[PDB]
Design a protein around this nucleic acid. Structure first.
Ligand code: ZN
Ligand code: ZN
Ligand code: ZN
Ligand code: ZN
Lengths: 72, 78
DNA sequence: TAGAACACCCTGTTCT
DNA sequence: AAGAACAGGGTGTTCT
């Protein structure tokens, strides 16, 4: 019942991982564009939780990958 | 000189009392009008706020606006 | 479940 | 200088 990426409430397995809906669509958008232009403003370790996941796409997106998320 | 004191992009004038670029000018007005907006840093409250990163952390960008002295009444303060 | 799309929000520029 | 508002993007939900 918990997103592996942002620890929000998960809506099932998306792209191989238990994630919420916001993290599902975020991951899709990133891998298809787009992630090449992401740059963390901290230290590549931002907190990704429900309230702060919007802040750093670079860390969000790295969390996605590390959690296993994958297209096929 | 000619650089924004909040983000270091090219400053365009002295806005709300401080040399800043246009994007920080309207960021700051939008932050202090209405609110609470609210902004939280996902880092350690010391994010790098520059042209390429200032969108990532409105919390640190707003703190840098305040720390530089921005204030609405800077005009009517003569 | 994967993807479309809408509504809403944030940003930075123009303002004929 | 200050402020409105347009255009462009991002987010997250609903819908299919
Ligand atoms: Zn999530
Ligand atoms: Zn980060
Ligand atoms: Zn600036
Ligand atoms: Zn920050």
């Amino acid at each position: 019942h918990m997103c592996l990426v942002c620890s929000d409430e998960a809506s099932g397995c998306h792209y191989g991982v238990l994630t919420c809906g916001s993290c599902k669509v975020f991951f899709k958008r990133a891998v298809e564009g787009r992630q090449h232009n992401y740059l963390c403003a901290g230290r590549n370790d931002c907190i990704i939780d429900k309230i702060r996941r919007k802040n750093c796409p670079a860390c969000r997106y790295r969390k996605c990958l590390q959690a296993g998320m994958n297209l096929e």
